[PDB]
Amino acid sequence: MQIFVKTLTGKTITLEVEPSDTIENVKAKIQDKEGIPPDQQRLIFAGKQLEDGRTLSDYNIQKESTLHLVLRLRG
Amino acid sequence: EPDTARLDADPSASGPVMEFRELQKGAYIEPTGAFLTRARVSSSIPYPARAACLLVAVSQATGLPTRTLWAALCANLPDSVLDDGSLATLGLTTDHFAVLARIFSLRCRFVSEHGDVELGLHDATSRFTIRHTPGHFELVADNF
Numbered sequence: 001m002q003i004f005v006k007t008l009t010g011k012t013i014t015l016e017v018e019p020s021d022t023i024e025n026v027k028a029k030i031q032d033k034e035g036i037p038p039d040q041q042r043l044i045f046a047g048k049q050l051e052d053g054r055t056l057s058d059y060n061i062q063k064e065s066t067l068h069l070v071l072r073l074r075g
Numbered sequence: 076e077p078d079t080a081r082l083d084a085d086p087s088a089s090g091p092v093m094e095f096r097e098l099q100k101g102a103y104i105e106p107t108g109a110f111l112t113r114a115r116v117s118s119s120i121p122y123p124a125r126a127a128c129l130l131v132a133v134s135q136a137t138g139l140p141t142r143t144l145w146a147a148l149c150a151n152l153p154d155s156v157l158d159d160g161s162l163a164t165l166g167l168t169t170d171h172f173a174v175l176a177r178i179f180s181l182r183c184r185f186v187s188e189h190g191d192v193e194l195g196l197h198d199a200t201s202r203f204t205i206r207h208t209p210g211h212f213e214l215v216a217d218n219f
Contacts, residue, residue: 008190071192073187
């Protein structure tokens with residue numbers, strides 16, 4: 001299936017995923033297209049902070065839904 | 076859920092795991108404060124001088140003492156979030172800043188090697204810009 005990822009700038013990215021893809025898998029898919037390492041990736045769905053070890057289905061994240069990508073910086 | 080588990084294991088934490096956004100409501104600029112945390116009187120983690128470059132930058136832009144900024148974090152975050160095990164090695168995060176913004180009414184545009192992110196409160200009393208490079212925070216005028 002396909003889901004969308006929307007960045008702070010409003011850009012819309014499209015990923016191909018399966019319901020059992022983990023949030024870590026999603027971050028890797030985003031890295032392939034955006035070049036942002038998973039360390040600097042925070043993903044939000046319906047206001048909830050998604051965690052790496054869970055799957056899209058664990059959050060009931062269904063086809064053609066939108067995730068929100070945000071930078072997390074450390075130093 | 077590594078974030079939830081690390082908070083549930085924290086002995087300095089109380090209550091259910093929730094986003095800081097919800098634990099301390101305020102005029103957040105989306106998505107400021109959208110990170111999982113738990114409620115705590117005050118942490119005893121001493122001021123991490125060698126790794127407080129984030130607090131130095133905020134201090135320089137606002138005039139708030141660095142140790143005033145730290146005390147605020149120690150009084151509002153559980154030990155697991157103040158020190159995930161890499162406090163001395165990797166320092167502080169934009170989540171720590173989201174807490175300072177809520178307490179002191181700050182807004183900061185972070186300019187990073189991998190894009191920008193704007194965090195803080197809407198009608199903030201202090202507005203500045205901080206630049207991020209791999210492992211470093213530095214106050215700037217308004218880069219890029």
